[PDB]
Nucleic acid binder design. Sequence first.
RNA 1: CGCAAGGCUGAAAAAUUGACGGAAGGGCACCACCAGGGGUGGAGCCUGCG
Lengths: 54, 96, 46, 102, 49, 33, 389, 243, 57
Amino acid sequence: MSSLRHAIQRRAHKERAQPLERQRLGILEKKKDYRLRARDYKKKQAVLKSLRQK
Amino acid sequence: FGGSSHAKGIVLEKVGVEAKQPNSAIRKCVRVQLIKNGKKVTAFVPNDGCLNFVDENDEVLLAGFGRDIPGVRFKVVKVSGVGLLALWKEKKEKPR
Amino acid sequence: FIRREQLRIKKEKDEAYEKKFKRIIAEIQNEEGRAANEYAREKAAR
Amino acid sequence: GSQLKRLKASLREQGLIGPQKSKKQKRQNANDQKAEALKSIREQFNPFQFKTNARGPKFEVTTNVIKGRPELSRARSEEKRRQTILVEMQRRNKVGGIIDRR
Amino acid sequence: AELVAKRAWTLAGEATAADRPVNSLLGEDMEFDHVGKPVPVVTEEVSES
Amino acid sequence: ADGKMSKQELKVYLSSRPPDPTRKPEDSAELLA
Amino acid sequence: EFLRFTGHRAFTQRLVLATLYGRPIHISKIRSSSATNPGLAPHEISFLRLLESVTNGSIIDVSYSGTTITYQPGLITGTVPGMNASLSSDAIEHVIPATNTRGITYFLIPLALLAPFSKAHLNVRFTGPGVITSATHGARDLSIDTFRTAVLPLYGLFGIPPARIELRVLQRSCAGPGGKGGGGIVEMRFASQVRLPKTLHLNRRPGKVRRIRGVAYCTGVAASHNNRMITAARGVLNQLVSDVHIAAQYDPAPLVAEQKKKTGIGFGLSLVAETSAEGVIYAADEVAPPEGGVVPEDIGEKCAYQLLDVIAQGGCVMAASAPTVLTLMAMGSEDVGRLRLGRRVVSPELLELARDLKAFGAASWGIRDADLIVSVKGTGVGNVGRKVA
Amino acid sequence: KILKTGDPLIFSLGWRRFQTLPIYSIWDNRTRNRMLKYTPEHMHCFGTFWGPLIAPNTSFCCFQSFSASNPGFRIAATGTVLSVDESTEIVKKLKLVGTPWKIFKNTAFIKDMFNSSLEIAKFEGAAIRTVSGIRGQIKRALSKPEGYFRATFEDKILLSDIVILKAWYPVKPKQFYNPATNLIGWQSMRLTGEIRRAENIPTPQNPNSTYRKIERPERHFNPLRVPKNLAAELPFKSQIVQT
Amino acid sequence: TSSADKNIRIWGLDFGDCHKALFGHQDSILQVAFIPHNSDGNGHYFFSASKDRTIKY
RNA sequence: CGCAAGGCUGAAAAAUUGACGGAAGGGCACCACCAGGGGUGGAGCCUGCG
């Protein structure tokens, strides 16, 4: 359950960053930023597919 | 069971030790054999990490389970004279 | 060759695991529910 | 000619497909090989079992055309992999063996 | 000395192409997942069937 | 010959399992329904 | 290299006890007398291959002459899917070559008494040209039917339950051309791995032999052969017992490789007398000579005479299954178990087993009168590796 | 203190006291017996060492150093013997890490991962993955830059992304065995911290591995860019009006 | 063994296994005969004569 | 749980409607004729197939 877990069970797992030898390329895209990118592209392609049908 | 509130048992075999998902109820359930009557019943360890304290052939106290396998009636309360939640909270060591 | 062998082994292993644990969970639920319904019948008669 | 027509002509030459002979024609046949030729027929009229070039030889030299069997070669190579690579994949971590010096 | 020395490239978790020697993957025996079905090669039993 | 045993004795002996040693329209209502 | 044995007598018993106790052995001077074919026999080297296959970490070393081997045993894993096979339910293949004269029970008896002490299951599948599922003239090996319903109930007595033993033949075969050859494939699946066998007690008299059931098998001959054999065996045993019942089994022929040939043409019979008391059964077998062509009624009378011999002779267990029950009694827990042997039952193979157990480190045996009660102290080893969940 | 794998440990197990160096491994989700690098706090992990064989379900204690000058609580680990074997199956994750070189819509060329087309031909068809979560498959070795390859991904990856391949390399424990013959005398193998403090070598620390705080700007995307021919062909009720 | 079902059988005479049943005549085969001498190296050859006006070696 | 689950045995027809053709006459085809065009095949590079 939720009372059968310690605080070390609850402890957050940190996110790694972009390596410092590669920081000029921008931020390291993880699942959240990838979800934002994919949502924007699927939305724009949905509008373009409806415009091509019309 | 019987006429008592808690029964004792021998842990015959931790069934579902090779189950995949961690907090599965098949992972948590343990086949024990009651001492007084002799029958093999199944009981829930309360937690998957708490399963590791239950070893084979250990005297186990078990009570009712009052609220994924609906119908397994018992839960393991004490193992070898020490309370299982105390073992899980790391209050006591298990005398073997 | 290693692709075909590993995919065959993965299919056979996953099918065997699914079959075995469906049998185990069904037998455990069957026995425990049978004893629970027998105890509820013997308790409701009191 | 067609493959159908040449197959029919070769089987009429080998006497496997011809008209229903009378008992007198069978008497003539018992009065007066074919499996060895049927093997060549079943090899020649199924030409995709083996790899052939179409052009023939580039420079003719005279000195005294199946160039490879891909089906048989693939089955042979898969048997070799069954005997070595799958066996090592089974015995990934297997220590010790019989040391046969004889 | 082995415990204090540097880890091998197989024991470091992230081995990029600068760490190891040139064709050092061919000497290792690792397992990994593949993607998708392979195509079935036509064998003589398949053509016979 | 009387060696033909039975299906039960064939099931215990000639199977793959070795034999363990520790065994020894009345009424109108129903017709209308 | 440490422990030292000589001779080729009870070779499989020595290797199996070495595997079970973990004591490294060195067996020297296999065939010193034979100048024509010195060294190891083909069935012996194939048993070495099978032992290496089912164990793990065992190192076997055969010398240049072939007359000395040494053997440092490992653990009996069985068919684990990481080391021995690819899947846990997969049968480990074992091929034994065409120049094999001994029966397959020569491989099955040590494997069946080494199998309850394994880690995972055992799923061995004996294929190949030289797999004879019959009795041999040979060293008078048991058949598969004799082996199954005569000695696996003894594991049932020890508490290794025969609900999970699966010994099944897929083809059956006799010897064929001379003693060499075979062809019939088998597979044995031990799924019942125990920690410690129970200390059993065979002490009460197994007096009333209640019934006789048996198997008469024919591979490659006419199917009237087993009917004539049943009439012969019933003509002998109807003086004594009202219920003798013998199943008839017939297989066409097994094919081996040279282009395949049909080999293993023969026929045989195997009687099992069941005593009403407990798990006490007396077995006897007889097979046709692989070149002779003798009368099936002669074979039926011969096996009935051997069965009446074993019924007259045996205390509780016959001498064919006496080494297996005695070495499992030695593997049991640190108590005494009491077997009731006949005085005629005691054999040089049984005596050699006693010498081997005393050399290995098990306790001696206590022999008193009642036929004699032999009492064995267990050593309490059991199986070494088992995943205690 | 936590207790690391590889570092030695004095096991009291049976009548034997013996110092050996174990390998700590979790049983991942009952699949592969993955090798950990430390023991988990407040959790039973599996260990694996090379010592004498004991019949299982035998409890044991486990110390680090038999010294009286330990300021607190000399006993380190407890537990029970699970099973015994030869040639264990412990497995550690090895990630081959690469970088995209040219990025098309799906097929990206990936550079700093392999060294030759022989290695790529071995790892053909392998499940490659982006850090972001995009799956993909190694398709074909690339000819002209030796060591690059073509991998068709799920969607378009970015040049900032890191492309990993998660292989499982087996790890065998070492076969070391000290007896703790205390009445005679014995050499005690030290721990890695004592070795580093004695022979003066700093602990290896990677600055790319140490966790940092990541400054994420709010992701704003470009507006929709409709092509000219489509924007001139679509009808009057849905024609785009831009002053 | 020459029968009236238009074939001959070859048995091995140890265990009496049929070596090969071989259908060889168009009518009921009357008689069969071995050549007795293996002095010429051919003693396992035999003739068979049948109602369809044929002998077969 | 019951049936299936007992070996004259031992690997490699149909037809009053069917089997195969021949001769004559049609139709079509850049796997045919006719008129042209273009490859490949010569030297080098290399995917792939054997």
